[PDB]
Amino acid sequence: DEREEEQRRRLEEVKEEAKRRERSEQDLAVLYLEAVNAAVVFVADSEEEAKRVADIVKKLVPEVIIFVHDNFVVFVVDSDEAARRVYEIVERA
Amino acid sequence: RLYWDDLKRKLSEKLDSTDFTSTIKLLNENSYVPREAGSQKDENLALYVENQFREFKLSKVWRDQHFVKIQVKDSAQNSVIIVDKNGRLVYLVENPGGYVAYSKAATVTGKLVHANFGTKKDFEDLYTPVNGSIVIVRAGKITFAEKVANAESLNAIGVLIYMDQTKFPIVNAELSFFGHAHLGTGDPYTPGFPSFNHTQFPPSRSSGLPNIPVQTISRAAAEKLFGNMEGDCPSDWKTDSTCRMVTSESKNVKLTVSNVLKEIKILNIFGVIKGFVEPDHYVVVGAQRDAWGPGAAKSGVGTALLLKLAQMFSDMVLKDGFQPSRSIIFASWSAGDFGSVGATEWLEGYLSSLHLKAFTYINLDKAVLGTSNFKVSASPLLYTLIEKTMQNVKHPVTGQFLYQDSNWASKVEKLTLDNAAFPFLAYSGIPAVSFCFCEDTDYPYLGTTMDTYKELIERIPELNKVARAAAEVAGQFVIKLTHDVELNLDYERYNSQLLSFVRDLNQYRADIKEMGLSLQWLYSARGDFFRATSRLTTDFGNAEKTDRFVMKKLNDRVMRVEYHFLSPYVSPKESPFRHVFWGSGSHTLPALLENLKLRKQNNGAFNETLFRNQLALATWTIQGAANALSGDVWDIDNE
Amino acid sequence: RLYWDDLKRKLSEKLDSTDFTSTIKLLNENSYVPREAGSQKDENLALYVENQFREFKLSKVWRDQHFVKIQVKDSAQNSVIIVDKNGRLVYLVENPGGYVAYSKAATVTGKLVHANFGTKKDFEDLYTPVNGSIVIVRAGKITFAEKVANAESLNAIGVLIYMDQTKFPIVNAELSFFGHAHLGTGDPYTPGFPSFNHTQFPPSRSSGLPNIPVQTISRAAAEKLFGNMEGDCPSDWKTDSTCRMVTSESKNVKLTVSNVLKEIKILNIFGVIKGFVEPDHYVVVGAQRDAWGPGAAKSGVGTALLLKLAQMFSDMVLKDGFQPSRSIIFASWSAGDFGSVGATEWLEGYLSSLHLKAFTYINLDKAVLGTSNFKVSASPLLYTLIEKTMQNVKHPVTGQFLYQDSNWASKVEKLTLDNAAFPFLAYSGIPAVSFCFCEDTDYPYLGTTMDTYKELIERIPELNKVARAAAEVAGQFVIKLTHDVELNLDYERYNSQLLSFVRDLNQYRADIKEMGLSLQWLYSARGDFFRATSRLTTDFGNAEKTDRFVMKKLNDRVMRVEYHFLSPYVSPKESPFRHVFWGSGSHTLPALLENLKLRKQNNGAFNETLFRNQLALATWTIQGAANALSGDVWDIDNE
Ligand SMILES: *[C@@H]1O[C@H](CO)[C@@H](O[C@@H]2O[C@H](CO)[C@@H](O[C@@H]3O[C@H](CO)[C@@H](O)[C@H](O)[C@@H]3O)[C@H](O)[C@H]2NC(C)=O)[C@H](O)[C@H]1NC(C)=O
Ligand SMILES: *[C@@H]1O[C@H](CO)[C@@H](O[C@@H]2O[C@H](CO)[C@@H](O[C@@H]3O[C@H](CO)[C@@H](O)[C@H](O)[C@@H]3O)[C@H](O)[C@H]2NC(C)=O)[C@H](O)[C@H]1NC(C)=O
Ligand SMILES: *[C@@H]1O[C@H](CO)[C@@H](O[C@@H]2O[C@H](CO)[C@@H](O[C@@H]3O[C@H](CO)[C@@H](O)[C@H](O)[C@@H]3O)[C@H](O)[C@H]2NC(C)=O)[C@H](O)[C@H]1NC(C)=O
Ligand SMILES: *[C@@H]1O[C@H](CO)[C@@H](O[C@@H]2O[C@H](CO)[C@@H](O[C@@H]3O[C@H](CO)[C@@H](O)[C@H](O)[C@@H]3O)[C@H](O)[C@H]2NC(C)=O)[C@H](O)[C@H]1NC(C)=O
Ligand SMILES: *[C@@H]1O[C@H](CO)[C@@H](O[C@@H]2O[C@H](CO)[C@@H](O[C@@H]3O[C@H](CO)[C@@H](O)[C@H](O)[C@@H]3O)[C@H](O)[C@H]2NC(C)=O)[C@H](O)[C@H]1NC(C)=O
Ligand SMILES: *[C@@H]1O[C@H](CO)[C@@H](O[C@@H]2O[C@H](CO)[C@@H](O)[C@H](O)[C@H]2NC(C)=O)[C@H](O)[C@H]1NC(C)=O
Ligand SMILES: [Ca+2]
Ligand SMILES: [Ca+2]
């Protein structure tokens, strides 16, 4: 699906615009969240932890749309139920 | 070909033409009361049940003979006496008529300290320590065995049990009652192996046997003891005004228990209606036959329900064309008053034959104790089956459906040690269910000589209609479990359970974080189990129900769900209740949570290595259950 | 439709055009030797085997990752030194190149006492006690772990192991060799549970880990030690003339072992050919891939056989129309030199998936060690399958059939701790088989740097034909187990076993009579088991093989035979080898026999209560196996 591609490229442009100022990782996480109307943005220490958390969330929440971008993970959902479940999983795992 | 609606309508039709009260009244005749385990009248009722099973023309009627050790009263009378520490007077408080089976025979003298119910929280919130003193407790919240174990954990030397009037509004203050204090089930002198002659009965004692004397006393004796005690009992205990806390400095209590062991022969009566497609898989329906006194509510109701259900299902199969796919076993147990001894020893004797064959147990004991509430305790695999049953069975009095609370499943209490379904669920891994029409209070005459038919028919004038409703619930359970090609066992329910587990872990996150541990593997196992259940439901949906082979594979995978939650890392002889959800011991999830709870209290009660092993073994039990449910071994995905 | 004769002839046809020596020599190239567990070359060979499985177009190829703890050599060199008790002289005997894994790191000094082989009979029939002294033993009859355990049971402080020239005719007297001393299988630091990250590796040590240092030495070092020792070694030991018994009064031995633990990643490579009727049931074929040195005979032969068998069966399925009803799993294990760690941890990880699904294991390790004798060690359920295989498979040299002794089954020795089929049989209850073309002596280069292709092809010039014959035996096993609707598992064999058991009891009649016990229940259980096997054979005869479901039920009853001999009263974590016939621990029949043996020999070693519990539990294990094999629970004729 090319729409997910265009969203990834939007996240890349947002990364550049964050690159222009001196931002913290959480500021860039908030920018990622607001850019693609995400529900949860988790910034891992490595790409491996990012993939692992994303796979756990996808197993527990199938309807979520996950974007792994460097060590950032972007969770986009269609309902508030999935948002709450994804938040609980990411916060407690 | 009959479908679910036809079977429901014919079942209700036969329930309308059934007289339960007549059989209850027959079970309370003088030829059957009292029926202590192994007594002559117990054998008479066993023979009557056997002849009824034969007259119903079941597929096969048989029996099992066991030789078990119980405890009975000795010629020497147990006594509760008050001694003055000056030595000038001794006062016989009571020579009780009842007793507590499996109590240790000893004489102990010391202070008498009142504990509310004998629970651990009652003991912790106590002003006076109980070490070296005798404890007096009320019955009602936990089993006698749990009270005695909690007392022994704090080095108490004796336990007295009484029935206060607030919890037991009995006019007769001198009423005696009976119980047992074995922290377990089955014959306590054959722990983990059947009580058969083949074993030649080797010397082995269950670890749940208490080491202090415990005795039941009347309320009059309790008030006589309170007369020699000081301190008001707390208001939140909600007991009688005569209640007191600790004996005076000048008064001590002497408790003398001299009960003796007795080897008896018990009979388990069985009837079987064979299935028409898969007769090797079966449901078990059981009821306790023995009772200390008359046991109308404790034993008569359940036995009458068993007889009526067997008769009605035999008539439906022989005359109404009912063709159950799987078999149905009706069981009359004995020695249930001593801790479900008959059922537990039957399970231990035929575990190898029941493995992945018996897929549901339905207990009928104490199913009619009132009319206000309908209470159920079962494995989650049956929850859906209960819900659908509660949504079309009407209350015997109000006429409404039993399904009134949509959040009932989140308020279910797990099966307890005194319930006969507990060894089925926790030891043999068979989904079990117990249910009852009851009140918010306990039936006051259980274990007493006033548990007669008169008291039952007086407290419940609609006894016939309530018994009919209980029999309808049980019969709908049986029909749903045996009539179709699908088992109606809801594996997805366990997902909810797992969620609760990790949520219960959240309140200790900080502890988990400072020990260098993570909960990520548990969440991954939850994801694997949820996906496996989803894949199984999808496969059931896409399968052809007439294709017996695909249905056979999927149903075998269903029948392995409860078994895979039995802990594979513990000795079944020393820890028979292996179920990590509903068993007892350090291998269960509640035990893990209690051990983890001890880490906040910064004293050395927390055991870190034990907790690490508990977490590892529970994590892999859950993960292995998910892997086994996912399919073949090569189709398991690992990160 | 292909029948047994067509499949056998096609198997032999494909075996004729197969080059085994080329694959063995390829496994001995420098990119694969040496391949200690977890090393880079071990992983290279794992990747090669995985890609070969992929090129064979198997049904599915996958892998498993384990993190296990092994023991390796330290920078500090282990040493054997001789010290003169006249503090004026010390003599460095040897800095050995090999080592014994899982030995305790310690330095011990004391007398050196010679035990013949480290067996219990060698230690008991010894003039000089070994308590507080170092023991030197020859290898060959029992595992290193058994030697160290027997020495530690008598309070020895150290163990030295060497290879005498009489039992090991090696020209190089300074040759080093390697072993392990863990009395068990699998990762000794995850005892009873898989070595997966999900467990988060809690602190747990196997009870089989020794507590004394043990070190391997060359024959030259052993002779240097004998130079400082006195007393001739007994003639029946049949060892070198340089052998001596005890050190002189002035000389002591100092042993220094400093091995270190190391956590490594091991890979288990798997390929599966799915069945055509019941793909959920499968046979497992395994071979060890790792080795301390080059491991040509200990690891190369088995891996080459695994590769060739997988290739040949994939070709038979894809092009020759071979349609196995059940699946076939080919497994390349790692860390086999440390006690079948890979296979044991795979079993412990996927027990829930293998339960009543994997019905036979075939081990290929050390299948070619000679040409004189053909030896087999297996569960009785495979004995018939072995016999029919020996009656039509020809010896690679003589050309005669392997079936020459009609009483071979009465001379089969049970699987030992060092065999990878032992955890399959004793722990997971899967019928297992190991076989080899060997000599009366042991292969002298096992565990040494001389286990190369040069020595193997020189000692066995017909290596290709012997490997072809071993592959033919394994392939006929697989075909007989997967081609027909019946499993070809002979349950009736166990009848004989039970007879032997009770006959072994006869020599203690008086003991059984003096303890007030009887053997009548054992004979009744024997009769019940014989009845169950006879009716199962009759039902197989009267059933129609085209009826998929009756055959499925009977085959399920067959597949439950081995599982029901696993002790259900023992903890699988602390005593994983639960099989009462072929396991280890107080729950086995040999342990019962040894305990009963201690009653005649009137020391205080006999434990009467333990013996009574053993007799009860074994009797009911046998009786429950018979009851489960007899059919439904209501069709058991017990009274
Ligand atoms: C219930 O447990 C308590 C606590 O162990 C028992 O009271 C203890 O009794 C012993 C001897 O009677 C006391 O030992 C003495 O302690 C004082 C403390 O100042 C010390 O100075 C003396 O040298 C002597 O060791 C102990 O202190 C005392 N503990 C308390 C808190 O008073 C009590 O006896 C137990 N109940 C029964 C019925 O045995
Ligand atoms: C299976 O085990 C049970 C329980 O151990 C055996 O029943 C018990 O058998 C003994 C000895 O036969 C009975 O004791 C005897 O009682 C009579 C009558 O008072 C007395 O004359 C003898 O001197 C002896 O004391 C005991 O009463 C009996 N127990 C019960 C509850 O019946 C049974 O015999 C065993 N069955 C087999 C086939 O071995
Ligand atoms: C905290 O829990 C751990 C784990 O249960 C306790 O460690 C355990 O201690 C017992 C007794 O010290 C050990 O029992 C041993 O059993 C083997 C079985 O073969 C036997 O050979 C030994 O002689 C001994 O009886 C057990 O191995 C050990 N378990 C572990 C995992 O270390 C510990 O004692 C507990 N701490 C406290 C303060 O209670
Ligand atoms: C291997 O075990 C033997 C026997 O246990 C050890 O020999 C014994 O060593 C003890 C020293 O603790 C000797 O006990 C001593 O006996 C004398 C005379 O009776 C007494 O006066 C002392 O107070 C002390 O109890 C004992 O006699 C001796 N012999 C026997 C036959 O017991 C031997 O040392 C052990 N080997 C080692 C530790 O390398
Ligand atoms: C699953 O468990 C294994 C076993 O512990 C984990 O592998 C180990 O991970 C640690 C990381 O804390 C590695 O330590 C690292 O060692 C390398 C060189 O060896 C060094 O460069 C690093 O600075 C760090 O000290 C350790 O080597 C590694 N063990 C092996 C045998 O590779 C693994 O990470 C765990 N997996 C997960 C997903 O948690
Ligand atoms: C004889 O065997 C019995 C049974 O194994 C042993 O009894 C054990 O005793 C220990 C403590 O000594 C307890 O922790 C166990 O619970 C007992 N086991 C059982 C099954 O009750 C007894 O120790 C042995 N006797 C000797 C001298 O070794
Ligand atoms: Ca028992
Ligand atoms: Ca293990």
PDB file of N, CA, C and O in Angstrom, chain B residues 331-357:
ATOM      1  N   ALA B 331     -22.086 -40.498  38.910  1.00  0.00           N
ATOM      2  CA  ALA B 331     -21.271 -41.035  39.989  1.00  0.00           C
ATOM      3  C   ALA B 331     -21.841 -40.627  41.337  1.00  0.00           C
ATOM      4  O   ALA B 331     -22.103 -39.445  41.577  1.00  0.00           O
ATOM      5  N   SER B 332     -22.033 -41.612  42.207  1.00  0.00           N
ATOM      6  CA  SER B 332     -22.388 -41.403  43.603  1.00  0.00           C
ATOM      7  C   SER B 332     -21.137 -41.690  44.422  1.00  0.00           C
ATOM      8  O   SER B 332     -20.706 -42.847  44.519  1.00  0.00           O
ATOM      9  N   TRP B 333     -20.546 -40.633  44.974  1.00  0.00           N
ATOM     10  CA  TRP B 333     -19.335 -40.717  45.774  1.00  0.00           C
ATOM     11  C   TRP B 333     -19.682 -40.968  47.237  1.00  0.00           C
ATOM     12  O   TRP B 333     -20.805 -40.732  47.686  1.00  0.00           O
ATOM     13  N   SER B 334     -18.689 -41.441  47.985  1.00  0.00           N
ATOM     14  CA  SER B 334     -18.794 -41.579  49.428  1.00  0.00           C
ATOM     15  C   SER B 334     -17.599 -40.898  50.079  1.00  0.00           C
ATOM     16  O   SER B 334     -16.647 -40.488  49.409  1.00  0.00           O
ATOM     17  N   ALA B 335     -17.663 -40.781  51.407  1.00  0.00           N
ATOM     18  CA  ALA B 335     -16.623 -40.130  52.205  1.00  0.00           C
ATOM     19  C   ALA B 335     -16.356 -38.701  51.739  1.00  0.00           C
ATOM     20  O   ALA B 335     -15.228 -38.209  51.821  1.00  0.00           O
ATOM     21  N   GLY B 336     -17.394 -38.024  51.242  1.00  0.00           N
ATOM     22  CA  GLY B 336     -17.243 -36.634  50.850  1.00  0.00           C
ATOM     23  C   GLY B 336     -17.105 -35.697  52.031  1.00  0.00           C
ATOM     24  O   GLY B 336     -16.528 -34.613  51.903  1.00  0.00           O
ATOM     25  N   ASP B 337     -17.631 -36.094  53.193  1.00  0.00           N
ATOM     26  CA  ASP B 337     -17.519 -35.269  54.390  1.00  0.00           C
ATOM     27  C   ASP B 337     -16.092 -35.195  54.914  1.00  0.00           C
ATOM     28  O   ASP B 337     -15.787 -34.310  55.721  1.00  0.00           O
ATOM     29  N   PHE B 338     -15.217 -36.099  54.480  1.00  0.00           N
ATOM     30  CA  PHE B 338     -13.831 -36.121  54.921  1.00  0.00           C
ATOM     31  C   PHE B 338     -12.886 -35.499  53.901  1.00  0.00           C
ATOM     32  O   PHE B 338     -11.666 -35.621  54.046  1.00  0.00           O
ATOM     33  N   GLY B 339     -13.420 -34.838  52.877  1.00  0.00           N
ATOM     34  CA  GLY B 339     -12.596 -34.145  51.908  1.00  0.00           C
ATOM     35  C   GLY B 339     -12.650 -34.742  50.517  1.00  0.00           C
ATOM     36  O   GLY B 339     -11.610 -34.919  49.878  1.00  0.00           O
ATOM     37  N   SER B 340     -13.858 -35.043  50.037  1.00  0.00           N
ATOM     38  CA  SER B 340     -14.065 -35.619  48.707  1.00  0.00           C
ATOM     39  C   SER B 340     -13.174 -36.841  48.495  1.00  0.00           C
ATOM     40  O   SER B 340     -12.490 -36.977  47.479  1.00  0.00           O
ATOM     41  N   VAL B 341     -13.191 -37.744  49.477  1.00  0.00           N
ATOM     42  CA  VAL B 341     -12.263 -38.871  49.472  1.00  0.00           C
ATOM     43  C   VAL B 341     -12.575 -39.822  48.322  1.00  0.00           C
ATOM     44  O   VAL B 341     -11.675 -40.256  47.595  1.00  0.00           O
ATOM     45  N   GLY B 342     -13.854 -40.157  48.140  1.00  0.00           N
ATOM     46  CA  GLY B 342     -14.217 -41.089  47.083  1.00  0.00           C
ATOM     47  C   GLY B 342     -13.844 -40.580  45.703  1.00  0.00           C
ATOM     48  O   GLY B 342     -13.211 -41.288  44.915  1.00  0.00           O
ATOM     49  N   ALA B 343     -14.218 -39.334  45.401  1.00  0.00           N
ATOM     50  CA  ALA B 343     -13.929 -38.770  44.086  1.00  0.00           C
ATOM     51  C   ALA B 343     -12.430 -38.606  43.867  1.00  0.00           C
ATOM     52  O   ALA B 343     -11.919 -38.908  42.781  1.00  0.00           O
ATOM     53  N   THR B 344     -11.709 -38.136  44.887  1.00  0.00           N
ATOM     54  CA  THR B 344     -10.269 -37.940  44.743  1.00  0.00           C
ATOM     55  C   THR B 344      -9.552 -39.265  44.524  1.00  0.00           C
ATOM     56  O   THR B 344      -8.652 -39.360  43.682  1.00  0.00           O
ATOM     57  N   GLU B 345      -9.943 -40.306  45.262  1.00  0.00           N
ATOM     58  CA  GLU B 345      -9.286 -41.595  45.090  1.00  0.00           C
ATOM     59  C   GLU B 345      -9.680 -42.255  43.775  1.00  0.00           C
ATOM     60  O   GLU B 345      -8.863 -42.957  43.175  1.00  0.00           O
ATOM     61  N   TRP B 346     -10.902 -42.015  43.289  1.00  0.00           N
ATOM     62  CA  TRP B 346     -11.263 -42.488  41.956  1.00  0.00           C
ATOM     63  C   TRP B 346     -10.406 -41.813  40.891  1.00  0.00           C
ATOM     64  O   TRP B 346      -9.911 -42.472  39.964  1.00  0.00           O
ATOM     65  N   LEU B 347     -10.217 -40.496  41.015  1.00  0.00           N
ATOM     66  CA  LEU B 347      -9.348 -39.777  40.089  1.00  0.00           C
ATOM     67  C   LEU B 347      -7.923 -40.312  40.142  1.00  0.00           C
ATOM     68  O   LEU B 347      -7.298 -40.539  39.102  1.00  0.00           O
ATOM     69  N   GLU B 348      -7.393 -40.528  41.347  1.00  0.00           N
ATOM     70  CA  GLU B 348      -6.022 -41.013  41.464  1.00  0.00           C
ATOM     71  C   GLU B 348      -5.884 -42.444  40.960  1.00  0.00           C
ATOM     72  O   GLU B 348      -4.812 -42.827  40.477  1.00  0.00           O
ATOM     73  N   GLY B 349      -6.942 -43.243  41.060  1.00  0.00           N
ATOM     74  CA  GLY B 349      -6.900 -44.606  40.575  1.00  0.00           C
ATOM     75  C   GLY B 349      -6.990 -44.719  39.069  1.00  0.00           C
ATOM     76  O   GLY B 349      -6.353 -45.595  38.476  1.00  0.00           O
ATOM     77  N   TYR B 350      -7.773 -43.847  38.431  1.00  0.00           N
ATOM     78  CA  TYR B 350      -8.011 -43.964  36.996  1.00  0.00           C
ATOM     79  C   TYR B 350      -7.571 -42.720  36.226  1.00  0.00           C
ATOM     80  O   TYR B 350      -8.134 -42.407  35.176  1.00  0.00           O
ATOM     81  N   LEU B 351      -6.569 -42.001  36.743  1.00  0.00           N
ATOM     82  CA  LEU B 351      -6.007 -40.864  36.017  1.00  0.00           C
ATOM     83  C   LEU B 351      -5.538 -41.245  34.618  1.00  0.00           C
ATOM     84  O   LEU B 351      -5.752 -40.494  33.659  1.00  0.00           O
ATOM     85  N   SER B 352      -4.889 -42.404  34.480  1.00  0.00           N
ATOM     86  CA  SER B 352      -4.387 -42.809  33.171  1.00  0.00           C
ATOM     87  C   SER B 352      -5.522 -43.077  32.191  1.00  0.00           C
ATOM     88  O   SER B 352      -5.348 -42.900  30.980  1.00  0.00           O
ATOM     89  N   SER B 353      -6.684 -43.500  32.692  1.00  0.00           N
ATOM     90  CA  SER B 353      -7.829 -43.748  31.823  1.00  0.00           C
ATOM     91  C   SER B 353      -8.614 -42.475  31.535  1.00  0.00           C
ATOM     92  O   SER B 353      -9.234 -42.362  30.472  1.00  0.00           O
ATOM     93  N   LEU B 354      -8.598 -41.515  32.460  1.00  0.00           N
ATOM     94  CA  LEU B 354      -9.318 -40.261  32.286  1.00  0.00           C
ATOM     95  C   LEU B 354      -8.546 -39.241  31.460  1.00  0.00           C
ATOM     96  O   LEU B 354      -9.138 -38.244  31.030  1.00  0.00           O
ATOM     97  N   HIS B 355      -7.252 -39.462  31.237  1.00  0.00           N
ATOM     98  CA  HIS B 355      -6.415 -38.484  30.554  1.00  0.00           C
ATOM     99  C   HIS B 355      -6.936 -38.212  29.149  1.00  0.00           C
ATOM    100  O   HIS B 355      -6.953 -39.108  28.298  1.00  0.00           O
ATOM    101  N   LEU B 356      -7.365 -36.969  28.915  1.00  0.00           N
ATOM    102  CA  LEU B 356      -7.873 -36.525  27.616  1.00  0.00           C
ATOM    103  C   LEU B 356      -9.083 -37.341  27.168  1.00  0.00           C
ATOM    104  O   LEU B 356      -9.306 -37.535  25.970  1.00  0.00           O
ATOM    105  N   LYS B 357      -9.871 -37.829  28.127  1.00  0.00           N
ATOM    106  CA  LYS B 357     -11.099 -38.552  27.820  1.00  0.00           C
ATOM    107  C   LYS B 357     -12.276 -37.932  28.563  1.00  0.00           C
ATOM    108  O   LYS B 357     -13.299 -37.605  27.954  1.00  0.00           O
TER     109      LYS B 357
END
